[PDB]
C-alpha cells in the first residue's frame, strides 16, 4: 500500500520523452542496440534486481531511454529506408516475428550499418549469457543475522549432571 509517509517522485520528473516505437521496430535493430547500450541496461537491471524499488534507479531508467533514443536517432539519420524495409519484413513475414523468416533485408540493413558506423552484428546468443560489469554505485549490505538475546534455552552438554537427590522422589521408590 501507499501512504502519506512514503515519498514518491513528482510529476515533473516522470514527464520525459519515452520510446514510442512498436514491437517490430524494436525487434528490428535489437542486436545493434545492445552493443551501444550495454552499460546502461546492465547497470539499470542490476540495481533493479537488488534494490527492488521503482523509486530507485530512476536516473538509470532515464539513461536507458536516452541511450535507446540516441541509437534510434543515429539509425534515423543514415538509411532510414533500409530499417523501414527490415521492420516491415519482420512485421509482415510471420506471426511471432522470427529473424529466420527473412534474412535478405537483415543482410541489407547490416550492410548499411557496417558501411555507415562500422558496427558488426553480434552473435545469436550474445545477450542471453550472464553479463558481468563494474558498477559505480556501491553494493547494498547483506542483512545481519537476526538476534534473539532471550531465546528458548536448553540444558547444555557441558553442564554437570550429579546423581539425583533421593532418587526419583516419586511414590516411595527411592
Amino acid at each position: 500500500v501507499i501512504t502519506n509517509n512514503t515519498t514518491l517522485p513528482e510529476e515533473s520528473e516522470l514527464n520525459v520523452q519515452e520510446l514510442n516505437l512498436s514491437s517490430a521496430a524494436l525487434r528490428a535493430g535489437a542486436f545493434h542496440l545492445g552493443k551501444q547500450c550495454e552499460q546502461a541496461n546492465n547497470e539499470f537491471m542490476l540495481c533493479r534486481q537488488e534494490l527492488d524499488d521503482p523509486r530507485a534507479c530512476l536516473a538509470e531508467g532515464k539513461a536507458v531511454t536516452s541511450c535507446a533514443l540516441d541509437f534510434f536517432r543515429k539509425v534515423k539519420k543514415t538509411c532510414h529506408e533500409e530499417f523501414t524495409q527490415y521492420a516491415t519484413c519482420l512485421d509482415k513475414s510471420s506471426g511471432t516475428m522470427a529473424f529466420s523468416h527473412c534474412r535478405k533485408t537483415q543482410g541489407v540493413f547490416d550492410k548499411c550499418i557496417k558501411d555507415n558506423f562500422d558496427w558488426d552484428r553480434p552473435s545469436y546468443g550474445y545477450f542471453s549469457r550472464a553479463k558481468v560489469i563494474q558498477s559505480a554505485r556501491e553494493a547494498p549490505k547483506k542483512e545481519e543475522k537476526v538476534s534473539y538475546p532471550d531465546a528458548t534455552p536448553g540444558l547444555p552438554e557441558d553442564y554437570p549432571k550429579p546423581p539425583a537427590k533421593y532418587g526419583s522422589r516419586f511414590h516411595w521408590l527411592e
Partner: peptide, 8 residues
Amino acid sequence: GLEQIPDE
C-alpha cells in the same frame, strides 16, 4: 516507424 521519433 522512425517518423514517430521527433527531430533533435
